[PDB]
Amino acid sequence: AANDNNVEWNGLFHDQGPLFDNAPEPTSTQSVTLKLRTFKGDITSANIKYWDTADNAFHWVPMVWDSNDPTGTFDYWKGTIPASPSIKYYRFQINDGTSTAWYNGNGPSSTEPNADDFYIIPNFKTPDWLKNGVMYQIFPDRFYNGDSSNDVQTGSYTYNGTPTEKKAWGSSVYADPGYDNSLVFFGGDLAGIDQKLGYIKKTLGANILYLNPIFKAPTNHKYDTQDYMAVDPAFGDNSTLQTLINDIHSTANGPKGYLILDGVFNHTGDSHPWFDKYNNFSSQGAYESQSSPWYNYYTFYTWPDSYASFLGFNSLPKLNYGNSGSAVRGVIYNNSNSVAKTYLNPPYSVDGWRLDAAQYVDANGNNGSDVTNHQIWSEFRNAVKGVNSNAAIIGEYWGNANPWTAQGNQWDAATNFDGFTQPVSEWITGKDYQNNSASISTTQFDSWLRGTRANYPTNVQQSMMNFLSNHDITRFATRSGGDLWKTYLALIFQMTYVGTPTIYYGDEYGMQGGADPDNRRSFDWSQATPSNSAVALTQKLITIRNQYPALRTGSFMTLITDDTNKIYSYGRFDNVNRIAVVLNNDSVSHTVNVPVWQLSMPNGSTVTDKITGHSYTVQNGMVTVAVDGHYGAVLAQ
Ligand SMILES: [Ca+2]
Ligand SMILES: [Ca+2]
Ligand SMILES: [Ca+2]
């Protein structure tokens, strides 16, 4: 490159990884020094343009040449944005004579962008253990029955006139005539999870557990809460939970662990004493009397049968959060004995909350996604972080969760349906996560990913819950038509991408399953061993991710987007390691010349494909590797 009235896009690069940003999570007194990469001697000037919310105006910071990379192929220009408490957004203007290019979260542009700027949010911190960990999601009733004495038997009890039904382990989840799918039980419990911690923390290596609802509720999913302060008897009691927590936190049975609980705060079940639709308590619930001490906890259109609920389901009456200081806000998060604080404080000390139907939380029966909803989550953050600054807050949202993350006053992250689950599904299986036809090419996949990462601040990106499947969508293995190799590819991408790899129990071995309730099948422990290739690969991948910080908090750079051979390659790198991931989404093998020079891997240096164990030497800035169809290589050094 040279000063030739042309900015070479291929040489440009910036993101908030270690090599380019010295303060990704700054306080009000820390300045932010940024570095922009370009080909050596390619430009004449560069400037940082940032919007400051402190004065609603743009500010200009001229950059200066700082250094060359070790290979002498690139230049690094630098500029610093001043320290202050205000949120700021930035982009770069890059000039080479008569040629100008712009660059921000969305990459290079010939024209100045108006969106996708990088974020600077002073004092906003997400838990580092979340950024660096691997999560395992468990639907309690279907993981493992560690205590048969608490099992719900067929006819054990009835709910809304329907008796419960117990299924043999491994059998179908669909309820038989006279029963209901939501009242089917296999016997999975907390004691079971506790007894299988070795599998989770050692066999696989995951250090974060996320559990679907565990509090008293009549259903098998338990999103229809009856008592937030008590573990459902079928899963055990509060002492069992305490024991499980201690074993998860223990460092004697593997890596230190973390527990995230499912917080269902938008609504309660219709059998909760505050509501008590079936009069299961001597006290008078809102449904029973307009004089009930909890009457105002809900919103009635026509008392008592017409009330606000979750998506119109009468079994899930919606909680009225009222205004700040309300009793409802108190019992959910403000009070020391609230649901949120009780479990975050001793003797439980859980590590986080996954916020169910978070977008809907509101006052007066309103639909959320409004000022009040955001005000509530802001108060929620203060409540939670006040008890434990390292307690995670992950909200459920299926689209762009920027509204609950980008201001650094609400959630730490969200369920990444839009930025991970969906694109991965359509690229690899050609189906959306609902198993309907929807396919995208490699170039489209790469673009989709970049755009969704750009929706979030960097620390949020690194903290996103990235799962292949979950309890509300079809199983990845079903969308893939049972092709195990498609799972291999998905796992490799998942374990090397930006955000918390989250394994939906069973996905690690290829468990299949259609739409709810079929996506909640019981776990087969004979398939949960290294003898299953997917399980063996999962363990290997987790070990690989835990070995390289670059995979968890390093930069991300696209290297290859080949729609002809269906090859996708990207690099993850920081001050120490440089890793080039090469994925083959085709049905046949392909030998790929990987442009590792882009990650500054020196000629003559060596890389090891952590997937196969084979070693290679960097020659002429390239690394040639053969990759099987629906498989990948992780070239690290
Ligand atoms: Ca040039
Ligand atoms: Ca049991
Ligand atoms: Ca009653």
DSSP string, 295-362: GGGB-EEETTTEE-EETTEEEEEBBB--STT-HHHIIIIISTTSHHHHHHSTTT---EEEETTGGG-B
Q: Are 582 and 575 in contact (CB under 8 A)?
A: no
DSSP-derived secondary structure letter, 204: I
Closest to 504 measured CA to CA, from 413, 572, 390, 425: 425
CA of 9 to the centre of ligand 1 (A): 9
Find out whether 21 is annotated in a ligand binding site. no
Cβ(394)–Cβ(414) below 8 Å: yes
Q: Is 409 annotated as a binding residue?
A: no
Same-domain check for residues 473 and 380:
yes
| Cα diameter, the chain | 84
Residue 394 to residue 372: CA distance in whole angstroms = 19
For the stretch 225-232, contacts whose Cβ atoms lie closer than 8 Å and that sit 24 or more positions apart, written own/partner, are: 225/264, 225/268, 225/269, 225/272, 226/268, 226/269, 226/271, 226/272, 226/273, 226/280, 227/272, 227/273, 228/339, 229/339, 229/342, 231/190
Q: What is the DSSP string of 321-337?
A: --STT-HHHIIIIISTT
Claim to verify: residue 412 and residue 326 sit in the same structural domain: yes
Instruction: Say whether 471 counts as a known binding-site residue.
Output: yes
Query: Same domain, yes or no, for 386 and 504?
Result: yes
Residues 25 and 73 in one domain: yes
Block residue for tokens 């669909």? 174
Region of 263 (left: φ > 0; alpha: ψ -120 to 50; beta: rest) is: beta
DSSP characters for 583-606?
EE-SSS-EEEEE-GGGGTPPTT-E
Does 584 lie in the same domain as 494? no
446 marked as part of a ligand binding site: no
Domain with residue 606: its CATH number is 2.60.40.1180
- 76: domain range? 1-124
| 138/626 Cα distance (integer angstroms) | 36
- Tokens 């200081």 belong to which residue? 325
Beta strands in 154-312 (DSSP E): 158-159, 162-163, 165-166, 184-185, 208-211, 215-216, 227-231, 258-263, 300-302, 306-307, 309-310
Task: Measure CA 439 to chain center.
Answer: 22
Angstrom distance (rounded) from CA 281 to CA 564: 65
Ligand nearest to the CA of 187: 2
User: Please, are residues 357 and 312 in contact by the beta-carbon 8 Å criterion?
Assistant: no
- Residue type at 437 in one-letter notation: S
Strand-strand pairing, 392-395 and 352-355: parallel
In one-letter notation, the amino acid at residue 576 is V
Q: Does 628 belong to an annotated binding site? A: no
CA distance 282 to 38: 72
Ligand nearest to the CA of 279: 3
Q: How was this one solved? A: X-ray
Looking at the structure, tell me whether residues 503 and 517 fall in a common domain.
yes
Instruction: Let me know the angle formed at the C-alpha of 184 by 182 and 186, rounded to the nearest 5 degrees.
Output: 135
Ligand 3 center–CA 329 separation, angstroms: 23
Q: Is 370 annotated as a binding residue?
A: no
Task: Please tell me what DSSP assigns to residue 267.
Answer: B
Q: Is 420 in the same domain as 340?
A: yes
Helix (H, G, I), strand (E, B) or coil at 192: helix
Beta carbons within 10 angstroms of residue 62's beta carbon: 11
Dihedral pair phi/psi, residue 35, rounded to 5°? -120, 135
Ligand 1 center from residue 504 Cα (angstroms): 48
Question: What is the torsion angle, in degrees rounded to the nearest 10, for the CA atoms of residue 394, residue 395, residue 400 and residue 406?
Answer: -60
**Which amino acid is residue 513, in one-letter code?**
G
Tell me how many domains the chain contains: 3
Residue 538 CA to residue 543 CA, distance in Å, equals: 9
Which ligand has the nearest atom to the CA of 169?
2
In this structure, which ligand is nearest to the CA of 191?
A: 2
For residues 327 and 428, membership in a common domain is answered with yes
Residue 539's CATH number: 3.20.20.80
> From ligand 3's centre to the CA of 609, what distance in Å?
64
Consult the annotation and say whether 288 binds a ligand. yes
Please check if 128 is assigned to a binding site: no
The number of the ligand nearest the C-alpha atom of 140 reads 2
Angle in degrees, CA 597, 544, 503, rounded to 5: 120
CA–centroid distance, residue 618 to ligand 1 (Å): 27
Half-sphere exposure of 294 (CA within 13 A, CB side): 22
Expressed in angstroms and rounded, the spacing between residue 216 Cα and the centre of ligand 3 is 17
- Of the residues 547, 582, 602, which one is the last residue of a structural domain? 547
* End-of-domain residue from the set 547, 570, 596: 547
Collapsing DSSP states into helix, strand and coil, what is residue 214? coil
Residues 129 and 103 in one domain: no
Query: CB atoms < 10 A from the CB of 617, how many?
Result: 11
Taking the mean position of all CA atoms in its chain, how far away is CA 216? Answer: 26
Whats the size of the chain, residue-wise? Answer: 637
405 Cβ neighbours under 8 A, 6+ residues apart: 411, 412, 413, 414, 456, 457, 460
Structure tokens at 181: 């799918």
CB 505 within 8 A of CB 142: yes
Please list the residues that pair with 579 across neighbouring strands.
Answer: 572, 636
Q: For residue 461, give the H/E element and its range.
A: helix 458-461
Rounded CA gap, 216 and 150, in Å?
13
Q: Does 524 belong to an annotated binding site?
A: no
For ligand 3, the distance from its centroid to the CA atom of residue 368, given in whole angstroms, is 30
**The domain spanning residue 39 has which CATH number?**
2.60.40.10
**How remote is the CA of residue 283 from the centroid of ligand 3, in Å?**
5
d(CA 17, CA 13): 11
What ligand has the least distance to the C-alpha of 45?
1
Q: How far apart are CA 633 and CA 549, in angstroms?
A: 18
Q: Using an 8 Å Cβ cutoff, are 453 and 498 in contact?
A: yes
Using an 8 Å Cβ cutoff, are 589 and 546 in contact?
no
- The catalytic site residues sit at 356, 396
SS3 at position 610: coil
549 in helix, strand or coil?
helix
Same domain as 456, residue 398:
yes
Residues lying with their CB under 5 A of ligand 3, a single-atom ion: 276, 279, 281
Q: How many CA atoms lie within 13 A of 310 on its CB side?
A: 20
Residue whose C-alpha is closest to residue 508's, from 540, 463, 465: 540
Q: Please indicate, yes or no, whether residues 109 and 138 belong to a single structural domain of this protein.
A: no
CB neighbour list of residue 486: distance below 8 Å, 6 or more residues apart? 428, 429, 476, 480, 630
For residue 497, the SS3 value is coil
Kindly state the tokens that stand for 349: 């000390």
CA of 40 to the centre of ligand 1 (A): 9
Taken in order 297, 301, 306, 311, the sign of the CA dihedral is: negative
To the question of whether residue 630 is assigned a binding role by annotation, the answer is: no
**Other CB atoms within 10 A of residue 347 CB:** 12
Secondary structure (3-state) at 49: strand
Give the resolution to one decimal, in Å.
1.6
The Å distance, Cα 561 to ligand 1 centre, comes to 24
Cis peptide bond prior to 26, omega within 30° of 0: no
What is the separation, in whole angstroms, between the first and last Cα of the chain? 27
Rounded to the nearest angstrom, the distance between the alpha carbon of 101 and the centre of ligand 1 is 11
* Residue 189 marked ligand-binding: yes
Angstrom distance (rounded) from CA 353 to CA 414: 11
Q: Among the three residues 124, 147, 169, which one is the final residue of a domain in this structure?
A: 124
* Residues 160 and 251 occupy one common structural domain: yes
How far, in Å, CA of 340 to CA of 359, rounded? 17
